[PDB]
Design a protein around this ligand. Structure first.
Ligand SMILES: CCCCCCCCCCCCCCCCCC(=O)OC[C@H](COP(=O)([O-])OCC[N+](C)(C)C)OC(=O)CCCCCCCCCCCCCCCCC
Ligand SMILES: CCCCCCCCCCCCCCCCCC(=O)OC[C@H](COP(=O)([O-])OCC[N+](C)(C)C)OC(=O)CCCCCCCCCCCCCCCCC
Ligand SMILES: CCCCCCCCCCCCCCCCCC(=O)OC[C@H](COP(=O)([O-])OCC[N+](C)(C)C)OC(=O)CCCCCCCCCCCCCCCCC
Ligand SMILES: CCCCCCCCCCCCCCCCCC(=O)OC[C@H](COP(=O)([O-])OCC[N+](C)(C)C)OC(=O)CCCCCCCCCCCCCCCCC
Lengths: 382, 382
């Protein structure tokens, strides 16, 4: 940990703190709130979730290093080349600085003659320009590794599945708001935002892309079964993600039929609720029994846990075992609403509230998934 | 050195940067015409000068440590404690955050219950408390050492003059603007206007208190003469400092006669010129021959600097040689402008601009004074 790295982490943290306080003060005072600020939130939500995700990844790396979780071999990373938690903190802080500057610029855009709607385009553009940059300048090894992993995950079950592929696929599974906001921005720029007015706020296509983080993980499990000849450990989760498929399909059908007004809509409404049950159990039980490795009968002196515990405090587990549940249902509803458009009111706000909560659920999922992989070696990755 | 100290350094630096830009923006887009403004600048100039002095002194300590200068032994400093440059940067950042918060509070007109003028009282108050806290915490050893040095300096004739005493008493010579603003604040809160009002409102002696940083240095080198009976290195230095008394006295007499109209006028002005010349040379040559030990003949391959060089780049020396020359006169300018009326138009602009320039010039002088002390035992401090 170089001293300049810690200085940069602290610098970006302080700048981000003061800029966020300035942002909330400007929103309270300088924001008119009479020009549909919701598209602004729906555009910046992807960046906010990404920055939160990177910061929580830094926390996860610190937790693994302190708790003895040898994630270096698990991720198949080079032992002499790793991105320590301070680097993730620095990247998150820098991206947060850019995000806050963009938001502040958008709030009082008359600061410059450039239109109010050109700030996010730069930010995400800069974001993309930070991800793809051939010059070996800013974490070139890390960005190139991430690009290889992104290509391997996103394409198809054409590559042998290692730990990094599955893990990033799951991270994208818990971060679908990024893809949904990408589609929303594309629709905004294609149908609205005439480009003539300086106001960037203004006075079934989503359903299929909603399943992309799940389609990339269902075919991955199918490929794993094909290459491993083990029906249970892969086909059960294949069905688990098929439950997400069915949930999204029935949400879309229910929304369309409610718009059509047919009585059969009510039937489909029931057809939604039941799936909202099974998914919220299928994604829950499979997560608590064989994903984390808890509720084991051979719990020994412990309760609801396993006999090999490496975290300093046992209560940390139990909160999660509750917290995950409290958030798991909170995830399953979200996946529906953004793909349903059922609620003209109180839908977008609740999705925006729940999205960082689901990112937090995925953050706490890593803490125990990597612990289980370190000890149990679950998943057959060696 | 500790990672958390570096993190705090970065955090405080970032908060100070963001709050400083916020202050600049507020000053541009606030402060309606009827605000006096200049009294606030006069009040907060002392605080800004102290913060800048601490920051530049951290820079100086880093420079000495990297250049091989054993400032630990020169300052008669114990090997224990001995705070590094990061600690000075942290103190400067924290004090700057407090200063920026106070200044922004006075700018932004907070809740109309607690009047604004209490904010400068608190800020400086805290700094006073930050020095006079009896509890063994918050750099207690360093603060106690500074308190003892302040007591020894302000009672200079009755104490043996060590290196630390002279060094601090000479820093006060460049920092006298803080004392000037403190006396101005005393007069303003005690006599000018009334404290029962709100906002900034509508838009001898002093010479004596101004000469105090030069009086405490003129009294030394007389004590050193009494102890050593060496007329050259001390009595000549004493005359160098007495040039300040002569120049300020002539400035005060000139201004008083111009205001009263005793027809002497230019009779003093000519005097006020020549001493303003003589002092501006008497000090200047000293800095280049007695302090830094430059222009040393028979140096060798070095062009008119010295035999032994400890700093990596010689050009810096030459830069300083110019800089001092163009800011040693400037120091004599402001030190006369603040002392009395002189030019009535603006005037405070020149003082407010030159005071940080004087602090910077003293910051430059520190490098080469301590280099000379390290190389050749100057002042017989041993
Ligand atoms: C005072 C208020 C309460 C505390 C602040 C709470 C902030 C929110 C939670 C932050 C968690 C901080 C824990 C980090 C992990 C442990 C670090 C540690 O051990 O410190 C020692 C480490 C040093 O590394 P070390 O642990 O190896 O210690 C050195 C060990 N030896 C001596 C063996 C070498 O210190 C740091 O690196 C400083 C921590 C910096 C991170 C602080 C927060 C950064 C914020 C990022 C920007 C915001 C982006 C947006 C965020 C969105 C989501 C919220
Ligand atoms: C089109 C959508 C594509 C996917 C969605 C966007 C990306 C989502 C996933 C981001 C992954 C972040 C890190 C995951 C892996 C962490 C593993 C780890 O600990 O290693 C640290 C990793 C890699 O470190 P490493 O140590 O593994 O690398 C060393 C490599 N070896 C050992 C081989 C030498 O660090 C990073 O990946 C950080 C750099 C990337 C930071 C993010 C840059 C921007 C990315 C694109 C943003 C998209 C903008 C648009 C979205 C919003 C629109 C509304
Ligand atoms: C790049 C342009 C910046 C312009 C902004 C204005 C600042 C001007 C340049 C500042 C230079 C400061 C660094 C020199 C000293 C440290 C050198 C070094 O190597 O240390 C690195 C140290 C860490 O290294 P270290 O000193 O532990 O030694 C090296 C250790 N290893 C080997 C592990 C690397 O980090 C710092 O201290 C970073 C500098 C922090 C302070 C930077 C200034 C910001 C503003 C200060 C707060 C406000 C003050 C108020 C006054 C305002 C001005 C009038
Ligand atoms: C009347 C007001 C006059 C003007 C204000 C006076 C300010 C004095 C500033 C001098 C500080 C620097 C001293 C030497 C530092 C360099 C030497 C070194 O390397 O050692 C580090 C030194 C000593 O550190 P140390 O770790 O070596 O500790 C000594 C070690 N033993 C005891 C073992 C020998 O550091 C300091 O002295 C720093 C102390 C903190 C800085 C002061 C902060 C508060 C100042 C408030 C002033 C009051 C307000 C003024 C009014 C404003 C207008 C109204």
């Amino acid at each position: 940990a170089p001293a300049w790295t810690t200085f940069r982490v602290g610098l970006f943290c302080g700048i981000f703190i003061v800029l966020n306080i300035t942002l909330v003060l400007a929103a309270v005072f300088k924001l008119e709130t009479d020009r549909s600020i919701w598209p602004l939130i729906r555009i910046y939500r992807g960046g906010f979730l990404l920055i939160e995700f990177l910061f929580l990844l830094g926390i996860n790396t610190y937790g693994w290093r302190q708790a003895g979780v040898n994630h270096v071999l698990i991720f198949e990373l080079n032992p002499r080349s790793n991105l320590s938690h301070q680097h993730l903190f620095e990247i998150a802080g820098f991206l947060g600085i850019l995000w806050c500057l963009s938001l502040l610029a958008c709030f009082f855009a008359p600061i410059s003659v450039i239109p109010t709607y050109v700030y996010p385009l730069a930010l995400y553009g800069f974001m993309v320009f930070f991800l793809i940059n051939p010059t070996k300048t800013f974490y070139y090894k890390s960005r190139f590794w991430l690009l290889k992993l992104l290509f391997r995950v996103f394409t198809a079950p054409f590559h042998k599945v290692g730990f990094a592929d599955f893990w990033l696929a799951d991270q994208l599974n818990s971060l679908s708001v990024i893809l949904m906001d990408l589609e929303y921005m594309i629709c905004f720029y294609s149908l609205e935002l005439k480009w003539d007015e300086s106001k960037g706020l203004l006075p079934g296509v989503r359903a299929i892309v909603q399943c992309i983080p799940a389609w990339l993980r269902f075919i991955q499990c199918l490929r794993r079964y094909r290459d491993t000849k083990r029906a249970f450990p892969h086909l059960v989760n294949a069905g688990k993600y098929s439950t997400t498929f069915f949930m999204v399909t029935f949400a879309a059908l229910y929304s369309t039929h409610k718009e059509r007004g047919h009585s059969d809509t009510m039937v489909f409404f029931y057809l939604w609720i039941v799936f909202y049950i099974i998914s919220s159990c299928y994604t829950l039980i499979w997560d608590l029994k064989m994903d984390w490795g808890l509720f084991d009968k051979n719990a020994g002196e412990n309760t609801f846990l396993r006999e090999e515990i490496v975290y300093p405090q046992k209560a940390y587990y139990y909160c999660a075992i509750i917290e995950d549940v409290i958030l798991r249902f909170a995830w399953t509803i979200q996946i529906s609403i953004t793909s349903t458009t059922l609620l003209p009111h109180s839908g977008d706000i609740i999705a925006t509230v729940f999205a960082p909560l689901e990112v937090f659920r995925r953050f706490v999922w890593n803490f125990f998934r990597l612990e289980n992989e370190h000890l149990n070696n679950c998943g057959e990755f060696r």
